[PDB]
């Protein structure tokens, strides 16, 4: 029933029981300098950054290296190009990056206060500038969508200069095979910061890699822990009553150290690019006044695919939506991308085989009941679908209802939630987007490329 085969794991062997000395608990972060575009575009850089033993890499002066005009992301330029669109803010307590104090200011805690409100780019910019002029609570403009191709064209054009595996869109990027928009993952988000502005502890959605460029003028301080330790960090969150996957928490560094967890700590200067490898747990605080831009990428590695599918299944256990629809993505990749890595090939092939089996069983049960199934094929830029009630991905066979609102709009449900409503599926239209033979031939057409 799982889309993963445990036997196929490529996770690195790490023995948490081996006690580590202070030195190994404070490892250095890999810090690369690129001299030429040739080096930035080398497959060797892709291999270096995605190696499962390398959780986070900083690529020093990458902006000047490739002649990226990061001034196009200055606050002044952004304001001039913006409209009145609403953006969101987090209000936080300004505190040292290694600290997070309880209300009485007597002890360190994990839960981290970070409340939501809304503003505009231009009004947040006035706050950022007034902060810098000195004219304690702070505000952080976060997850600002730079997705409008027209409004943000010069900005987005500058990012086309990055090496392919870092780009927002690329054929070696799983997120570019979603076929619909996931704002901030396969589109750019902007972060406008004052000193103290925090992005609290997390793994990326579905454990996808992340790219972050600091525009400046200030620095950002980063903290990171290898994927391997994530369950131990989750246990701290639970101990302190904050949700690991969806809550706002800031680790106590000595808790991680006591638990034998190495923590990477480094400073990201203006023009530096941080590559966050798959599954790396990280948190970030602005040291100065700066803007960052960031998005996700899913390079075609077995480690990435495994960690994305593992989180997909864990989200299902925890009743948390996976905003990357991994079954849909897996078939799209299989149909359109040559996979030469034998580990990654075996994993995708295994996932597709389970998906075919499920769809076949589902279809045979419907046919046995005499339930009409209509074909509604895929079309360009069509989204992937999820159950309205339980938020699981619903792939291929769709159980849709128009009962509420207009009889011409339908909500999608999984089989389970559809059958809980009307056990005879009365009033449920069943669609299939891929005929049995379309999936069979896509599966057979998917073979290991040399």
């Amino acid at each position: 029933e799982s889309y993963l085969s445990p036997a196929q794991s490529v996770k690195p062997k790490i023995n948490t029981e081996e006690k580590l000395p202070r030195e190994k608990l404070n490892p250095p972060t890999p810090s690369i300098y690129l001299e030429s575009k040739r080096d930035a575009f080398s497959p060797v850089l892709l291999q270096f950054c995605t190696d499962p033993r390398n959780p986070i890499t900083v690529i020093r002066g990458l902006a000047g290296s490739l002649r990226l005009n990061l001034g196009l992301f200055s606050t002044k330029t952004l304001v001039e190009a913006s409209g009145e669109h609403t953006v969101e803010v987090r209000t936080q307590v300004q505190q040292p990056s290694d600290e997070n104090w309880d209300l009485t200011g007597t002890r360190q805690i994990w839960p981290c206060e970070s409340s939501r409100s809304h503003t505009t780019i231009a009004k947040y910019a006035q706050y950022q500038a007034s902060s810098f002029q000195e004219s304690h609570i702070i505000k952080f403009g976060t997850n600002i969508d730079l997705s409008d191709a027209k409004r943000w064209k010069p900005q987005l054009q500058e990012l086309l200069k990055l090496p392919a595996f870092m780009r927002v869109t690329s054929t070696g990027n799983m997120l570019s095979h979603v076929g619909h928009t996931i704002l901030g993952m396969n589109t750019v988000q902007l972060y406008m910061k004052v000193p103290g502005s925090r992005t609290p502890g997390h793994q990326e959605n579905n454990n996808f890699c992340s790219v972050n460029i600091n525009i400046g003028p200030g620095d950002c301080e980063w903290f990171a822990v290898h994927e391997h330790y994530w369950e131990t960090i989750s246990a701290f969150c639970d101990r302190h009553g904050v949700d690991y996957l969806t809550g706002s928490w800031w680790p106590i560094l000595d808790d991680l150290y006591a638990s034998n967890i190495p923590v990477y700590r480094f400073v990201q200067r203006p023009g530096d690019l941080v590559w966050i490898n798959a599954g790396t747990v990280h948190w970030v605080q602005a040291t100065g006044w700066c803007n960052n831009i960031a998005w996700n990428v899913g390079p075609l590695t077995a480690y990435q695919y495994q960690l994305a599918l593992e989180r997909y299944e864990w989200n299902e256990v925890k009743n948390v939506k996976s905003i990357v629809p991994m079954i849909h993505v897996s078939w799209n990749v299989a149909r359109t991308v040559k996979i030469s890595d034998p580990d990654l090939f075996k994993m995708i092939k295994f996932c597709l085989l389970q998906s075919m089996k499920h769809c076949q069983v589902q279809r045979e049960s419907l046919v046995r009941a005499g339930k009409k199934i209509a074909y509604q094929g895929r079309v360009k830029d069509e989204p992937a679908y999820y159950c309205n009630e339980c938020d699981v991905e619903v792939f291929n066979i769709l159980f849709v209802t128009s009962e509420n609102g207009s009889r011409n709009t339908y909500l999608v449900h999984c089989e389970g939630c559809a059958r809980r409503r009307s056990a005879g599926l009365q009033g449920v239209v069943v669609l299939e987007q891929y005929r049995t033979e379309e999936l069979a031939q896509a599966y057979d057409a998917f073979t290991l490329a040399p």
Partner: peptide
């Protein structure tokens, strides 16, 4: 063909309170 509705997918930082 019939119009199927979807929830927009977006990354957004955690928020308290």
């Amino acid at each position: 063909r019939i119009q199927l509705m979807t929830k927009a997918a977006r990354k957004s930082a955690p928020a308290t309170g």
